[PDB]
Design a protein around this ligand. Structure first.
Ligand SMILES: Cn1c(=O)n(C)c2cc(NC(=O)CN(c3cccc4ccccc34)S(C)(=O)=O)ccc21
Ligand SMILES: [Mg+2]
Ligand SMILES: [Zn+2]
Length: 313
């Protein structure tokens, strides 16, 4: 009950900032996550013993892929931690509990391939789930781990509170399917501009939580340039392997995934920043003004990719 997690001074200060990097020491990431739950939620949200057993079963079920790994899970949870702490009074007790868990679990048992590669491979998961294939799998794995003995971190909630939080987690994890992001942000745009955005409309909250999840999931584009640049190598290492596996099926992959077209990467980044990331953090900053540092950092990194193209690095 009286057992706080405390971090070293540099981490204690830097963890509050959006651009915080969780660092290369794997063994500190569980402590970082717990620290965040305790300040985001309270020392009493979760029985520590159950939380710790949950965190380690979740860690065990992330695979050793270059990008979609345990480190990505904790990075995405940290961004959500920053958004929740800069928007203290906007979110329910259940939402604060559910969203940090949703983020930690959002890519459970990812294999480093897109939904598209499962569909063309004809992977069994693509028969079981026709859309948001990996994301429905991630939620399924979350429910599995919650049902291991000693792993029910929500055991003290009522029957209806438990169903509310598992429903927040399901919507939150489905929303990380970027195919769904485009329409979700367009609707949030229209709603904000016509002035119909109402945070007491559950269907509006759902949409706003969906955009937060896209924002946290993409948060590698909002780090200081050297973090963003080095993470892009991990991302492209998965993409090029997928490209390779497409060619193995007799399918020319999109250039973003073709390792023979590495030259085209910097222009592809611009595309991605302009088509996906900037629109995402723009709309998020309109709905949640204190999340502006994410937009500013995203713009700084767009400018750094422009410099890569212009030969200036
Ligand atoms: C930090 N960071 C970064 O620098 N890049 C390039 C990043 C890409 C993603 N994530 C995807 O690029 C996902 N994909 C998509 C791309 C475009 C439209 C899609 C539309 C629908 C679905 C999927 C789309 S993909 C190629 O097909 O796997 C996440 C983080 C990134
Ligand atoms: Mg995912
Ligand atoms: Zn992810």
């Amino acid at each position: 009950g009286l057992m706080q997690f405390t971090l070293p001074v540099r981490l204690c200060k830097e963890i509050e900032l959006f651009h915080f990097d969780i660092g290369p020491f794997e063994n500190m990431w569980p402590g970082i996550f717990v620290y965040m739950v305790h300040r985001s939620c309270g020392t009493s949200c979760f029985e520590l013993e159950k939380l710790c057993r949950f965190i380690m079963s979740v860690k065990k079920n992330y695979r050793r892929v270059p990008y979609h790994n345990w480190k990505h899970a904790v990075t995405v949870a940290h961004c959500m931690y920053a958004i929740l702490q800069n928007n203290h009074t906007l979110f329910t007790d259940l939402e604060r509990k559910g969203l940090l868990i949703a983020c930690l679990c959002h890519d459970l048992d990812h294999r480093g391939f897109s939904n598209s590669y499962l569909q063309k491979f004809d992977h069994p998961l693509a028969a079981l789930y026709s859309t948001s294939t990996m994301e429905q799998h991630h939620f399924s794995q979350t429910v599995s781990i919650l049902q291991l003995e000693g792993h029910n971190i929500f055991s003290t909630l009522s029957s209806s509170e438990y169903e509310q939080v598992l429903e927040i987690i399901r919507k939150a994890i489905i929303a990380t399917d970027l195919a769904l992001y485009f329409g979700n942000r367009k609707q949030l745009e229209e709603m904000y501009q016509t002035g119909s955005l109402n945070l007491n409309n559950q269907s509006h909250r759902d949409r706003v939580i969906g955009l937060m999840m896209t924002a946290c999931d993409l948060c590698s584009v909002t780090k200081l340039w050297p973090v963003t640049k080095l993470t892009a190598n991990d991302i492209y290492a998965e993409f090029w392997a997928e490209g390779d596996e497409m060619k193995k099926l007799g399918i020319q992959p999109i250039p973003m995934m073709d390792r023979d077209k590495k030259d085209e990467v910097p222009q592809g980044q611009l595309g991605f920043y302009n088509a996906v990331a900037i629109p995402c953090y723009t709309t998020l900053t309109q709905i949640l003004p204190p999340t502006e540092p994410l937009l500013k950092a995203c713009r700084d990194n767009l400018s750094q990719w422009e410099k890569v193209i212009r030969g200036e690095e």
